[PDB]
Amino acid sequence: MKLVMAIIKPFKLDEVREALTSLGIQGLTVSEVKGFGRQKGQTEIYRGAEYSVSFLPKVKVEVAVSDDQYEQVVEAIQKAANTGRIGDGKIFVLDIAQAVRIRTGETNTEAL
Amino acid sequence: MKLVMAIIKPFKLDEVREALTSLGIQGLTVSEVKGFGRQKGQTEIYRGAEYSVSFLPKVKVEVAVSDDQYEQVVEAIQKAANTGRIGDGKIFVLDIAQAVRIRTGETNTEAL
Amino acid sequence: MKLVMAIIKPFKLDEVREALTSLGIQGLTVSEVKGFGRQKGQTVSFLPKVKVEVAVSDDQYEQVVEAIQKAANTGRIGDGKIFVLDIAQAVRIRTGETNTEAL
Numbered sequence: 001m002k003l004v005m006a007i008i009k010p011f012k013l014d015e016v017r018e019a020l021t022s023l024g025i026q027g028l029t030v031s032e033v034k035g036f037g038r039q040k041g042q043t044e045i046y047r048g049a050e051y052s053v054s055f056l057p058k059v060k061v062e063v064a065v066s067d068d069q070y071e072q073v074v075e076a077i078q079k080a081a082n083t084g085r086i087g088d089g090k091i092f093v094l095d096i097a098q099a100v101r102i103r104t105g106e107t108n109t110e111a112l
Numbered sequence: 113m114k115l116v117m118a119i120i121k122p123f124k125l126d127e128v129r130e131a132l133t134s135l136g137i138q139g140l141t142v143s144e145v146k147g148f149g150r151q152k153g154q155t156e157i158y159r160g161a162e163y164s165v166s167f168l169p170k171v172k173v174e175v176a177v178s179d180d181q182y183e184q185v186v187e188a189i190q191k192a193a194n195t196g197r198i199g200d201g202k203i204f205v206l207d208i209a210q211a212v213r214i215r216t217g218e219t220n221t222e223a224l
Numbered sequence: 225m226k227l228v229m230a231i232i233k234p235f236k237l238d239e240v241r242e243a244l245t246s247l248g249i250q251g252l253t254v255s256e257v258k259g260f261g262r263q264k265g266q267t268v269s270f271l272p273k274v275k276v277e278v279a280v281s282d283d284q285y286e287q288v289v290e291a292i293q294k295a296a297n298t299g300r301i302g303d304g305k306i307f308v309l310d311i312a313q314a315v316r317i318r319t320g321e322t323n324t325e326a327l
């Protein structure tokens with residue numbers, strides 16, 4: 001079982017959600033975060049700007065999915081978010097040891 | 113070691129917190145998120161509403177605990193949050209490879 | 225690969241950030257959270273914290289953990305916790321680079 005975590009530009013949330021819905025994902029969690037990547041949050045070109053570091057608003061998307069679906073989920077997020085521009089995002093896949101649907105007690109692959 | 117991550121209805125935070133403190137947890141992190149589950153955020157019953165997707169406010173509760181204690185934590189959260197209604201929550205358990213208490217430098221299960 | 229997650233005092237964010245970027249880290253995610261530890265929010269209550277998340281390779285995560293530990297410490301209760309999780313796969317969206325190349 002996999003937790004696919006993606007950090008994307010906020011305006012891309014709808015398209016990413018749409019892309020995942022098409023795959024039949026059974027749930028999604030999103031949160032507000034800030035971050036930088038290898039350009040260190042630089043959006044200006046004043047002298048010395050590359051020595052600065054800034055945090056930029058992002059959205060973190062988390063989707064719990066089965067092993068036989070996670071690769072397609074990763075690809076869908078890539079395809080939805082990629083516009084060929086810096087900051088378009090990064091995806092991290094983590095493993096889920098156990099899952100439980102609170103209302104029903106269903107577990108693991110049933111619970112995703 | 114295990115990170116227990118529960119996504120619950122916001123109004124249940126206090127009852128879940130109290131259940132866990134009574135159980136004896138020694139730490140807890142909470143954050144605001146939005147999300148949907150297998151009902152796609154549907155809270156209305158008008159004709160066609162079943163084709164829509166919405167994000168609902170939730171709270172994410174995270175508790176790092178030892179292997180021999182995580183099942184008790186999961187069940188305590190389930191008992192506190194379960195009211196037999198959709199959206200009552202989802203619990204994901206991830207493995208923690210290492211832990212450190214920053215003040216003291218204590219590690220592993222001693223840091224939790 | 226590892227996801228190093230640290231819950232720190234909000235005023236320590238700049239030093240933790242600088243410790244990491246000076247070390248050579250080239251990405252960082254931060255979130256607003258609340259929490260309590262062994263002292264139950266007492267000098268039960270929730271207190272504001274920052275969650276820092278850094279994805280790093282196996283050969284650098286120990287340096288990263290140590291850098292955060294030193295940077296976030298003050299010797300006072302509430303200094304925080306570092307939890308290290310494993311990352312199975314990573315992708316840089318723009319380039320399609322994967323795993324350690326993506327971080």
Ligand SMILES: Nc1ncnc2c1ncn2[C@@H]1O[C@H](COP(=O)(O)OP(=O)(O)OP(=O)(O)O)[C@@H](O)[C@H]1O
Pocket residue numbers: 007008034035036037038039056058085086087088089090250251252253254277278279280316317318319326327
């Ligand atoms: N190593 C990392 N650890 C934690 N979060 C990261 C890491 N790298 C990136 N992030 C998060 O992902 C967001 C998007 O990163 P971004 O797309 O800028 O990656 P990048 O490596 O700089 O690639 P690009 O050159 O395409 O910009 C960042 O703002 C940050 O929130």
Ligand SMILES: Nc1ncnc2c1ncn2[C@@H]1O[C@H](COP(=O)(O)OP(=O)(O)OP(=O)(O)O)[C@@H](O)[C@H]1O
Pocket residue numbers: 026027028029030062063064065101102103104111112119120145146147148149150151168170197198199200201202
């Ligand atoms: N597969 C998933 N991936 C990521 N987050 C999820 C997933 N399933 C649920 N969540 C998160 O958990 C919250 C609560 O989910 P919820 O209790 O509705 O689960 P469910 O599977 O729909 O069960 P129920 O039928 O009891 O509603 C969601 O709003 C979302 O934030």
Ligand SMILES: Nc1ncnc2c1ncn2[C@@H]1O[C@H](COP(=O)(O)OP(=O)(O)OP(=O)(O)O)[C@@H](O)[C@H]1O
Pocket residue numbers: 138139140141142174175176177213214215216223224231232258259260261262263271273300301302303304305
């Ligand atoms: N076991 C835990 N699970 C989840 N979050 C935790 C845990 N322990 C601590 N945290 C988070 O880390 C923050 C800081 O914890 P804190 O430094 O107070 O830990 P502590 O064990 O009480 O150590 P100290 O005695 O140095 O205060 C908490 O407010 C909470 O957000």
Ligand SMILES: O=C(O)CCC(=O)C(=O)O
Pocket residue numbers: 035036037038039040041042056086087088
């Ligand atoms: O995130 C952006 O929008 C541009 C800045 C960037 O790519 C970075 O900080 O790595």
Ligand SMILES: O=C(O)CCC(=O)C(=O)O
Pocket residue numbers: 147148149150151152153154155168198199200
């Ligand atoms: O989250 C709710 O309160 C109801 C909606 C729901 O259960 C879902 O989207 O899965």
Ligand SMILES: O=C(O)CCC(=O)C(=O)O
Pocket residue numbers: 259260261262263264265266267271301302303
């Ligand atoms: O978080 C603080 O700043 C002090 C309270 C504390 O250490 C705790 O709740 O464990």
Ligand SMILES: [Mg+2]
Pocket residue numbers: 036037038039040086087088
């Ligand atoms: Mg970038």
Ligand SMILES: [Mg+2]
Pocket residue numbers: 148149150151152198199200
């Ligand atoms: Mg539901």
Ligand SMILES: [Mg+2]
Pocket residue numbers: 260261262263264301302303
């Ligand atoms: Mg404490």
Ligand SMILES: [Mg+2]
Pocket residue numbers: 095207310
């Ligand atoms: Mg593992």
